[PDB]
């Protein structure tokens, strides 16, 4: 969402000429304008060409010193960082915006056009999750927030108190990929022959037990897990509670 806005903003900068593409950038929540604001700037043609100059000014910095330097100029003007941080969840947004600019800046040193970069943004916005480098940075302070992590990222980690709200869930293995009990090699049965799915399923809680063991083990003083008379079989509560499958 902050990326989308940066994309509008850049378009705006690369051509404040086009009345419409600028109005969109001024409208992004990042810039903090008002419905009353947007309206009045639409009726005051002298004020608009002022914002247009302001924006022609940014393109110039962009062209000479870089995207980051331009963006920092913009921000100091519309006093963005200061305001954003004041606005609830506004830290998340602000540090993401800076992060985008750090990426935006490398990508620029491998393109000799501003427009190319813009194009570079669109692409990354349409087909993401590439590197660990475009992953979200965690804020310094997340350190004083209750931390919610996965069993896997928790291997290694230690915590004073831990909660296991959904430690009873299962999910039956249905794919017949199992390890041969004697040769210990992996076998893919391309016909879901029940004997193999059965062997696969065993290997499934054989794994959840390991997960449970990692789960109980992270705490120092205390741990509490949630338990429920869980059932999945659509067999009408026949003394079921296939809780014994977790």
């Amino acid at each position: 969402l902050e990326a989308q806005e940066m994309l509008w903003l850049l378009q705006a900068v690369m051509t404040p000429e086009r009345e419409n593409t600028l109005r969109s950038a001024l409208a992004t929540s990042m810039m903090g304008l008002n419905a009353l604001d947007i309206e009045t700037l639409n009726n005051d043609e002298h004020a608009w060409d002022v914002v247009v100059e302001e924006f022609d000014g940014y393109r110039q910095i962009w062209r000479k010193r870089g995207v980051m330097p331009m963006l920092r100029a913009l921000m100091s003007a519309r006093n963005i960082a200061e305001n954003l941080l004041a606005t609830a969840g506004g830290e998340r947004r602000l540090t993401d915006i800076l992060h985008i600019s750090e990426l935006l800046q490398e990508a620029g040193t491998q393109l000799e056009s501003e427009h190319a970069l813009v194009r570079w943004l669109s692409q990354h916005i349409l087909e993401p999750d590439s590197n660990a480098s475009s992953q979200q940075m965690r804020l310094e302070s997340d350190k004083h927030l209750v931390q919610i992590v996965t069993i896997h990222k928790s291997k290694g980690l230690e915590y004073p108190l831990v909660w296991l709200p959904f430690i009873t869930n299962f999910r039956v293995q249905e794919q017949a990929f199992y390890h041969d009990r004697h040769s210990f090699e992996a076998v893919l049965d391309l016909n879901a022959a029940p004997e193999s799915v059965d062997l696969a399923e065993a290997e499934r809680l054989a794994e959840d037990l390991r997960l449970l063991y990692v789960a109980l083990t992270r705490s120092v003083w205390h741990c509490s897990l949630g338990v429920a008379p869980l059932v999945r079989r659509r067999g009408d509560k026949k003394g079921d509670t296939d809780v014994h499958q977790s």
Binding site: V187, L190, N191
Partner: protein, 181 residues
């Protein structure tokens, strides 16, 4: 002087489409439709095999004979299918005597269905003709000579293991060759 490839997810996908292209496009409607019913397109193939293709290839319990072509299996299947499509284009007689409760006369519903399941094939699929078999015919004097249905519902009838096996063997080396080049 090697270059550490980083992705491989796109390399894999592309190999997978190349696979589909060279193994499906050239296919004639009867086989094509069959494949199509197993996977609508290469994205769906990968979805079913992507795990494998990565790291040590698992052993396949019971692989297909190191040569069955799509073409062959298809034959065998079609042929197993039509011989029973003939011994039914003769529902002249099926209009039988001796009863049971479950089996209703809204069986004339069940009937025509398969009577009309006499298209020019193109699908290994076949809506339910449970009743008119012979294995349960007895399980529900009773039935005649369409014990060829006991036989059609025994053998799996699918192109799946065959195509799959071929894909990973091939998709792997596509990836490989590409990475060398």
């Amino acid at each position: 002087e090697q270059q550490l490839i980083e992705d491989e997810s796109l390399l894999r996908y592309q190999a997978c489409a190349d696979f589909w292209r060279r193994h499906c496009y050239p296919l004639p409607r009867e086989i094509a439709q069959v494949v199509f019913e197993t996977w609508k397109g290469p994205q769906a193939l990968l979805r079913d095999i992507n795990r494998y293709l990565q790291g040590e290839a698992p052993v396949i319990k019971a692989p297909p004979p190191d040569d069955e072509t799509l073409a062959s299996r298809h034959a065998q299947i079609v042929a197993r299918i039509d011989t029973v499509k003939q011994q039914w284009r003769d529902a002249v007689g099926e209009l039988d005597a001796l009863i049971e409760s479950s089996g209703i006369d809204r069986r004339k519903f069940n009937r025509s269905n398969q009577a009309k399941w006499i298209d020019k094939i193109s699908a290994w699929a076949e809506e339910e003709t449970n009743s008119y078999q012979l294995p349960e015919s007895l399980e529900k004097p009773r039935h005649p000579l369409f014990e060829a249905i006991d036989q059609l519902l025994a053998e799996p009838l699918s192109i799946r293991d065959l195509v799959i096996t071929r894909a990973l063997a091939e998709i792997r080396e596509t990836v490989a060759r590409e990475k060398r080049r």
